[PDB]
Amino acid sequence: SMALKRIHKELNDLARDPPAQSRAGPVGDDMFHWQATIMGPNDSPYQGGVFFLTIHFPTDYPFKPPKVAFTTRIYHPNINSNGSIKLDILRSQWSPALTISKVLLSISSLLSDPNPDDPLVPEIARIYKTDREKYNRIAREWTQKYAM
Amino acid sequence: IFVKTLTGKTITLEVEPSDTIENVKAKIQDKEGIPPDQQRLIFAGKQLEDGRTLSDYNIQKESTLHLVLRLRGG
Amino acid sequence: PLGSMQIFVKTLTGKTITLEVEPSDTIENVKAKIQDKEGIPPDQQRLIFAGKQLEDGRTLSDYNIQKESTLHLVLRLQNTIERFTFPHKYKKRRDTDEKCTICLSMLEDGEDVRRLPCMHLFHQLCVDQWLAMSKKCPICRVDIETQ
Ligand SMILES: [Zn+2]
Ligand SMILES: [Zn+2]
């Protein structure tokens, strides 16, 4: 009752105003389960690639954050092989003033701005924090073999 | 330039190419009520840091920036 | 209104309103000038300058206000929400259309409405649920317990 109405309203605005380099929408008649496309950040090694994501809306939405996960494999210090994204705004820095289009654009901003000091996959963090040149090469190969 | 704010209202801003990003965040603070601590600006999927200017990103007239709350990769 | 000179006011989020005033302006006129720029009734406003709060029926020069002076704008005054927040019913002006960032529906006359010490606006039902679990503002991340 209380949550589906926002998902309805977000969807209408998404149709009339398609976001900047990002497409999303529900699967079938499941309004709490969406898919999403994400474009590559312009300077980052993921540039030009398209990344798929699963999103699940909790029943408490928008008071609790939506569960967002990558399905395309991506090489990133804060995104593991299971597609998980540990991101503060998806956990405790969550605000109900964030729509999906702005959540998705926040994720693309994370790709252009990794954080190795507080990592999720520390193996990827060390490679970044010692020679970003070799990190950018690997991340570029991952985004070209899965997301092009 | 234009800015998509958290309320969805695209707002016009009058800046010249010499303005830094911290300048732009301050103008948004006066028209939105959000401190530059909590402002994250995004153009073409990439974030914009407080140090560099608008011309350093070669952002030209009528470009549309987007505004989300400050993130922290974890 | 093309006042003889200008002053500024600062909200909790650091937002700055520039006003045109003459030293012979009453304070209730200053509150109304802010009403025509952000949509806050003088009913809700509380102004603070030089450690003292300004009373309705005096003048700016009585409080010895200068050019480039800065006023501070705070709100006038499960149940702790009603102790830090101002409830009222919205009144539409006449961009001046406001929407609730929680339910994403625009704000209408007669709707029970909420305003936080950051001078942001939401429906009463929508933000009362969110404040029941975070006590911060969805738009600017300012605690409602801020003073
Ligand atoms: Zn609402
Ligand atoms: Zn606020």
Residue numbers in the entry:
A (entry chain C): 0 to 147
B (entry chain D): 3 to 76
C (entry chain A): -3 to 73, 258 to 274, 289 to 341
Could you share sentences copied from the article?
To understand the molecular basis of activation of ﻿ubiquitin transfer by Ark2C we solved the structure of the UbArk2C fusion in complex with UbcH5b~Ub. Crystals of the complex that diffracted to 2.8 Å were obtained following purification of the stable UbArk2C–UbcH5b~Ub complex, and the structure was solved by molecular replacement. The density was well defined for most of the structure, and for UbArk2C residues 1–73 (UbR), as well as 258–274 and 289–341 of Ark2C, could be positioned, while for the conjugate residues 1–147 of UbcH5b and 3–76 for ﻿ubiquitin were resolved. In contrast to previous Ark2C complex structures, UbArk2C–UbcH5b~Ub clearly adopts the primed conformation, with E2–Ub contacts similar to those observed in previous activated RING–E2~Ub complexes. Importantly, Ile44 of UbD interacts with the crossover helix of the E2, while the Ile36 centred patch of UbD contacts residues in the RING domain, including His314 and Ile333. Furthermore, the β1–β2 loop of UbD adopts the ‘loop-in’ conformation and is oriented towards the RING domain as observed in other activated complexes. Contacts between residues in β2 of UbR (Thr9, Lys11 and Thr12) and the C-terminus of α1 of UbD (Gln31, Asp32 and Gly35) extend the E2~Ub binding surface by ~190 Å2 so that in total ~1080 Å2 of the E2~Ub conjugate is buried in the primed conformation. Comparison of the structures of UbR bound Ark2C in the presence and absence of the E2~Ub conjugate shows that close-packing at the UbR–UbD interface is, in part, achieved by displacement of UbR in the activated complex. For example, while the linchpin Arg of Ark2C (Arg335) contacts Gln92 of UbcH5b in all three structures, only in the activated complex does Arg335 make the essential contacts with Arg72 and Gln40 in UbD to prime ﻿ubiquitin for transfer. In the structure of the activated Ark2C complex, crystal packing contacts position a ﻿ubiquitin molecule close to the active site of UbcH5b, such that Lys6 and Lys48 are ~11–13 Å from the active site raising the possibility that a UbA binding site has been captured.
Two related RING E3 ligases, Arkadia (RNF111) and Ark2C (RNF165), have central roles in the regulation of Transforming Growth Factor β (TGFβ) signalling. Both E3s are positive regulators of TGFβ signalling because they mediate the attachment of degradative ﻿ubiquitin chains and subsequent destruction of negative regulators of the TGFβ pathway, such as SMAD7 and SnoN/Ski. Previously we reported that the RING domains of Arkadia and Ark2C are bona fide ﻿ubiquitin-binding domains, and that docking of the RING domain onto a regulatory ﻿ubiquitin molecule (UbR) enhances ﻿ubiquitin transfer. Most E3s possess a RING (Really Interesting New Gene) domain that binds the thioester linked E2~﻿ubiquitin (E2~Ub) conjugate and brings it into close proximity with the substrate. ﻿ubiquitin is then typically transferred directly from the E2 to a lysine residue in the substrate.
